[PDB]
Structures are given as C-alpha cells and as structure tokens.
Amino acid sequence: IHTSPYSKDAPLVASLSVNQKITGRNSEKDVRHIEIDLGDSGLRYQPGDALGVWYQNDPALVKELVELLWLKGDEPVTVEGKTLPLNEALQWHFELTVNTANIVENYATLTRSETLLPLVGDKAKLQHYAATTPIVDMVRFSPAQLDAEALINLLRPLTPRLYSIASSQAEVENEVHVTVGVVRYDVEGRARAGGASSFLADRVEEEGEVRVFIEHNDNFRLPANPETPVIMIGPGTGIAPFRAFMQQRAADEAPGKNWLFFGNPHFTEDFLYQVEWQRYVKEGVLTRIDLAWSRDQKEKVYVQDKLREQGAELWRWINDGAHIYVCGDANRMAKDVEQALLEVIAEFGGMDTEAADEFLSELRVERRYQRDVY
Numbered sequence: 229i230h231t232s233p234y235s236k237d238a239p240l241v242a243s244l245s246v247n248q249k250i251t252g253r254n255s256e257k258d259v260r261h262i263e264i265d266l267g268d269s270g271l272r273y274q275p276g277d278a279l280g281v282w283y284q285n286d287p288a289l290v291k292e293l294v295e296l297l298w299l300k301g302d303e304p305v306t307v308e309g310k311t312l313p314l315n316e317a318l319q320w321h322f323e324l325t326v327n328t329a330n331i332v333e334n335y336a337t338l339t340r341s342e343t344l345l346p347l348v349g350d351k352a353k354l355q356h357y358a359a360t361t362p363i364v365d366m367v368r369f370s371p372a373q374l375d376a377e378a379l380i381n382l383l384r385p386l387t388p389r390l391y392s393i394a395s396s397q398a399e400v401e402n403e404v405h406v407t408v409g410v411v412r413y414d415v416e417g418r419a420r421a422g423g424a425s426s427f428l429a430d431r432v433e434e435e436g437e438v439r440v441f442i443e444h445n446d447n448f449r450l451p452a453n454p455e456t457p458v459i460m461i462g463p464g465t466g467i468a469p470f471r472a473f474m475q476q477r478a479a480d481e482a483p484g485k486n487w488l489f490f491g492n493p494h495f496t497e498d499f500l501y502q503v504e505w506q507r508y509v510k511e512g513v514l515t516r517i518d519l520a521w522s523r524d525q526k527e528k529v530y531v532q533d534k535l536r537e538q539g540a541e542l543w544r545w546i547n548d549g550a551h552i553y554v555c556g557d558a559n560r561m562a563k564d565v566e567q568a569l570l571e572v573i574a575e576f577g578g579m580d581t582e583a584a585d586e587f588l589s590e591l592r593v594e595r596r597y598q599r600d601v602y
C-alpha cells in the first residue's frame with residue numbers, strides 16, 4: 229500500500245534547507261538541527277522512523293591521505309567492478325573516518341611499519357590505537373608506500389548513517405528534520421570529524437544536495453490512541469524522535485498526557501529545542517518535563533536520577549496504561565535508564581527484582597516499552 233521507489237540502494241536526491249547550530253555559544257558540543265526538503269518526491273515516514281543518509285568524505289581529508297601516501301586521484305582503482313580514480317573511490321566509496329583494530333593490524337602487517345608492528349597480535353593495544361588514532365594520522369605516524377589498490381583493499385566500504393527523525397509530516401510537510409551531534413576532535417592540532425555528521429554540518433550541503441532514504445521502524449511508535457499517556461526518555465541527541473512525537477500529538481490534538489525526561493551537560497547551553505518545549509508546555513501538549521543537567525552543579529545528575537525521583541508518579545502513569553520510550557546512547561544511558569525503571573517498578577509496584585523484570589518484559593512484549601538506542 230506504500231511501496232516507494234527509493235531505498236538504501238536508489239536513495240532520493242533531496243536537498244538541505246536548514247543547517248542550524250542548536251547548542252549555545254559556550255556548549256562543548258556542536259549539535260545541528262537539520263531540515264531536508266523532500267520536494268515532490270512523496271517520500272513518507274512516521275515519527276519513530278529514521279533517516280538514512282549517504283555522505284561523502286571531506287575532500288581535504290582525501291587529499292591529506294593521498295599526499296601522505298605520495299599519490300594523486302589519477303590512480304585507477306576497481307570498486308565493485310568499475311574503474312575509478314582513487315580520490316573519487318575515497319570520497320564516495322570507502323570509510324576513512326573510523327579506524328579499527330583490524331585496519332591497524334592489517335596496515336601494520338602490510339607495510340611492516342617499524343612503529344606499528346609491536347601492536348600486531350595484541351588485541352588491547354590494537355583497539356586502543358584505533359580508538360585514539362584515525363586512519364589519516366596512523367598513516368602520518370607510519371610512513372610507508374601503498375599502491376592505490378592496496379589502500380582500497382584495506383578500507384571498509386562507505387555506508388549511510390541513520391539519524392532518528394525529529395519531525396512529523398503532519399507538521400512539516402514534504403520535509404524531513406534530524407538532530408545531528410557533530411563528532412569533532414583533534415589530533416595534534418589537526419581537526420578531525422565523523423564522516424556523515426560533519427558532511428551535513430559543514431560540506432555538501434550548501435543550501436544544497438543530500439541522498440536519503442527512510443529506515444522504517446515499526447517497533448518505535450506512538451500509541452494508535454490519542455489518550456494513552458506517553459513517557460519519553462531521550463537525553464542528548466536522543467530527544468529527536470520525541471520532537472517527532474510531540475509535533476504529531478499536537479497536530480492530531482491528542483489529549484493523552486505526555487512526559488519528557490531530557491538531560492545534557494548545561495541548562496544554558498545544551499537544552500536542545502528549549503523554546504519549543506516551552507511552547508508545548510504552555511499549550512498543554514507536553515504535560516510534564518524533567519531535566520537533568522550533569523555539569524551544572526558538582527554532583528553529576530542524569531535522567532535515571534530523575535526517573536528514580538519521579539518513581540511514584542511514573543508508577544501511576546504506567547498503571548494508567550502509559551507507553552515508555554527510550555532513545556539515545558545504548559552504551560551507558562539505555563542500561564542505566566533500564567535499571568532505574570526496574571528500581572521504580574520494584575519499589576512503587578510491590579515486587580523486587582524478578583517480578584519487576586517480568587513486569588518490564590511484559591511491557592515490552594505488548595509494545596509499551598520501546599527503545600531506539602545506538
């Protein structure tokens with residue numbers, strides 16, 4: 229019923245309409261609010277879905293790599309059977325911004341780096357090297373000749389990055405919006421960044437071309453049912469889909485109660501989309517909002533601490549049939565929010581541990597505990 233030309237292979241050639249820094253002038257983060265125009269295409273998506281974004285590497289990063297190897301583009305290389313100049317394969321077809329244990333160990337072996345060979349066969353050193361030294365600086369630090377084919381052989385194909393959608397088409401129309409944290413760091417003074425997030429944030433697009441597709445997520449959806457209470461836990465860039473949810477519930481005039489738990493380092497710099505949350509609260513759509521600012525005062529505070537502190541009202545909402553949503557960092561945040569939810573269930577339901585556990589699992593079976601963590 230909704231088939232669509234357009235997918236990860238065959239993406240829509242869309243364009244960039246807004247690229248706006250959303251963190252204040254003293255934040256440590258660079259977060260962009262992006263809006264991509266979907267023209268005529270009819271690309272459709274629902275709150276909860278994600279936008280797949282094809283990206284190109286930075287041409288100044290390819291150039292730095294090409295030059296440290298003594299090559300230029302000129303060098304023909306084979307990518308999936310077609311013959312291309314090396315700087316095109318590097319800009320469009322291969323990953324340059326993520327280093328791995330495997331790429332280090334292979335590059336070490338291949339070039340016989342005098343300086344990286346001591347890492348070969350040592351997992352912990354390899355992962356540590358990779359986790360701190362991007363490809364381009366591994367080559368700076370270990371000069372060695374590499375043909376263009378041996379260079380391409382070593383790299384991993386480029387793949388699109390997924391960004392939770394931050395808009396509802398009922399509000400925005402033929403537009404998609406996304407909330408991108410831009411990965412930025414430096415090695416000795418050389419500015420480095422995430423391939424896709426820095427592409428969106430700094431390069432291709434000027435107001436300008438982007439290749440996109442929808443990654444549907446039927447396991448991350450508002451209640452069909454405008455009256456069911458929703459609980460939303462999305463710190464940092466995890467707030468995206470919750471901006472999709474609220475655009476939807478405001479446009480549909482759903483009367484259901486909505487609660488947002490949000491968190492980030494500083495109230496005055498990292499309150500993503502702060503004046504929307506104020507208008508939502510003012511219009512009656514956002515019922516409750518709890519905020520955790522980790523760096524504003526000494527003791528570190530996170531959304532899990534706020535869940536714990538609102539346990540009793542959380543338990544009352546859960547008992548009113550609330551849906552619970554978690555979005556954001558899978559590594560520590562998802563796990564710490566889970567435990568806090570288990571502790572709220574145990575303490576305000578009457579149960580302790582295994583029963584709290586069965587209770588959350590029943591909520592998930594049942595589709596009242598949905599997560600999009602990454």
Ligand SMILES: Cc1cc2nc3c(=O)[nH]c(=O)nc-3n(C[C@H](O)[C@H](O)[C@H](O)COP(=O)(O)OP(=O)(O)OC[C@H]3O[C@@H](n4cnc5c(N)ncnc54)[C@@H](O)[C@H]3O)c2cc1C
Pocket residue numbers: 278325326327358359360361362389390391392407408409410411412413414421422423424425426465466468600601602
């Ligand atoms: C379903 C889903 C939804 C998502 N939603 C969002 C979203 O709403 N917003 C969002 O921002 N992201 C989201 N992401 C994550 C996003 O897809 C990306 O993985 C993220 O944008 C990073 O991609 P990148 O291309 O910019 O960087 P990459 O190029 O993939 O790289 C990150 C890296 O930089 C290096 N690195 C970083 N810092 C340093 C340092 N100091 N020292 C040396 N090495 C370092 C690399 O080795 C690795 O660490 C989502 C992911 C998924 C799967």
